[PDB]
């Protein structure tokens, strides 16, 4: 039990900040994750050997796509680590255990294609899961990996604690379906403003964990401008491949996914910040005041995209 992970000094300090970038050294990401689990949860949350075997099976089941990759998984888990560390007392032992795992697993076996593309392609996963198609798949892969011999990182939980943590993970992963985010945030906005938001109401906690999941999932828009700008290229590399595949099915893709419309990206980033990101981190900041740095970084990046449009870069 006496075996800590320790990071170099710059990482030890910067990993506590919301805008931390996990860096280009893939072989350090498992250790960064274990470090975050040890501080977020405890050195006793998980058997190290099991957790290490789980992490590497999760990594193996992320594909080599430009954005929805192993780096995205660890990045989204680090944003969750930062939310949990800045909100020490608000979350149960089971939630701390479940949420970092849910974030690491939330896009397992992603192919770089939206729920929409699977539905138009008539992918078998769209027959199995009519809504939140990829997200039900990601949860399904998470359960598959938990069931591999030596991979049950939760084995020391009671039967009912195990059912609760898999239920946290399932709702947490379903919530990363952005189609569900709009209504979830509107409801949380109404509840916060009429004063009815109650964190002892399980269905309220669920909604708040959902918004955290969106916040962590979108956290590329909360980095320093050079990270945000370079990640946008990975995001659009997937979208334009999906666009190309839509054109192959005989469907004009939306402009966001059409590589012939790269010029419209700065404006498309504005829409996205104004319709999705800013509202997300605003309602999050209202519910969890110490997550304000995410909102502040998001606003900084909106301003940088405004400057791109004004040809000031
Ligand atoms: C331009 O899109 C994105 N840019 C950056 C990132 C960063 C966080 C990774 N993610 C998306 C993204 O996930 N788009 C797909 C889903 C989606 N887009 C919209 C939308 C767009 C424009 C205006 N209103 C709404 N609703 N749903
Ligand atoms: Mg996803
Ligand atoms: Zn994701």
What is the helix (H) or strand (E) element at residue 80, kind and residue range?
Answer: helix 70-85
| Known catalytic membership, residue 68 | yes
Greatest CA separation for the chain:
60
40 to 77, 104, 149, 176: CA distances (angstroms): 11, 14, 26, 21
Nearest CA among 219, 302, 225 for reference residue 268: 302
Q: What domains can be seen in the chain, in order of their start residue? A: 28-310 (1.10.1300.10)
Distance CA 219, CA 210 (A): 14
Pick from 272, 281, 301 the residue to mutate for probing ligand 1's pocket: most ligand atoms within 8 Å of its CB: 272
The answer to whether 72 is a known ligand-binding residue is yes
DSSP 8-state assignment for residue 110: -
Of ligand 1's atoms, which has the minimum distance to the CA of residue 275? 24
Check: CB of residue 255 under 8 Å from CB of residue 268: yes
Ligand 2 centre and the CA of 68: distance in Å?
Answer: 7
The answer to whether 260 is a known ligand-binding residue is no
212 to 32, 76, 104: CA distances (angstroms): 20, 10, 14
Distance CA 269, CA 251 (A): 23
Method in brief: X-ray
Q: State whether the beta carbon of 302 lies less than 6 angstroms from ligand 1.
A: no
Q: State whether the beta carbon of 176 lies less than 6 angstroms from ligand 1.
A: no
**φ, ψ of residue 9 in degrees (nearest 5):** -55, -55
Residue recorded with tokens 């940088």: 304
Give Cα 69 distance to the centre of its chain.
11
Of ligand 1's atoms, which has the minimum distance to the CA of residue 256? 1
Which structure tokens are listed for 54? 């789980």
Resolution (A): 2.1
Distance CA 265, CA 220 (A): 16
Nearest CA among 17, 172, 153 for reference residue 82: 17
Ligand 3 centre and the CA of 262: distance in Å?
Answer: 23
Q: State whether the beta carbon of 220 lies less than 6 angstroms from ligand 1.
A: yes
Nearest CA among 275, 278, 268 for reference residue 239: 268
Check: CB of residue 145 under 8 Å from CB of residue 61: yes
Check: CB of residue 117 under 8 Å from CB of residue 245: yes
Of ligand 1's atoms, which has the minimum distance to the CA of residue 265? 1
The three-state secondary structure class of 146 is: helix
Check: CB of residue 94 under 8 Å from CB of residue 168: yes
Whats the size of the chain, residue-wise?
313
């Amino acid at each position: 039990g006496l075996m800590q992970f320790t990071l170099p000094v710059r990482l030890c300090k910067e990993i506590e900040l919301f805008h931390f970038d996990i860096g280009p050294f893939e072989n350090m990401w498992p250790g960064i994750f274990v470090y975050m689990v040890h501080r977020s949860c405890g050195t006793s949350c998980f058997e190290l050997e099991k957790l290490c075997r789980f992490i590497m099976s999760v990594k193996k089941n992320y594909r080599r796509v430009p954005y929805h990759n192993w780096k995205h998984a660890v990045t989204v888990a680090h944003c969750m680590y930062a939310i949990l560390q800045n909100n020490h007392t608000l979350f149960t032992d089971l939630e701390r255990k479940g949420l970092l795992i849910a974030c690491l697993c939330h896009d397992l076996d992603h192919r770089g294609f939206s729920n929409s593309y699977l539905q138009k392609f008539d992918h078998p996963l769209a027959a199995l899961y009519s809504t939140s198609t990829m997200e039900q798949h990601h949860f399904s892969q998470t359960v598959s990996i938990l069931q591999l011999e030596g991979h049950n990182i939760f084995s020391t939980l009671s039967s009912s604690e195990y059912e609760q943590v898999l239920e946290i993970i399932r709702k947490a992963i379903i919530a990363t379906d952005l189609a569900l985010y709009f209504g979830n945030r509107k409801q949380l906005e109404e509840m916060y403003q009429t004063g009815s938001l109650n964190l002892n109401n399980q269905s309220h906690r669920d909604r708040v964990i959902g918004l955290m999941m969106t916040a962590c999932d979108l956290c590329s828009v909360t980095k320093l401008w050079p990270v945000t700008k370079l990640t946008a290229n990975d995001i659009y590399a997937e979208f334009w491949a999906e666009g190309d595949e839509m054109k192959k099915l005989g469907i004009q893709p939306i402009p966001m996914m059409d590589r012939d419309k790269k010029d419209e990206v700065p404006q498309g980033q504005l829409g996205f910040y104004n319709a999705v990101a800013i509202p997300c981190y605003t309602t999050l900041t209202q519910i969890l005041p110490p997550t304000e740095p995410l909102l502040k970084a998001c606003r900084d990046n909106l301003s940088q995209w405004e400057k791109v449009i004004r040809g000031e870069e």
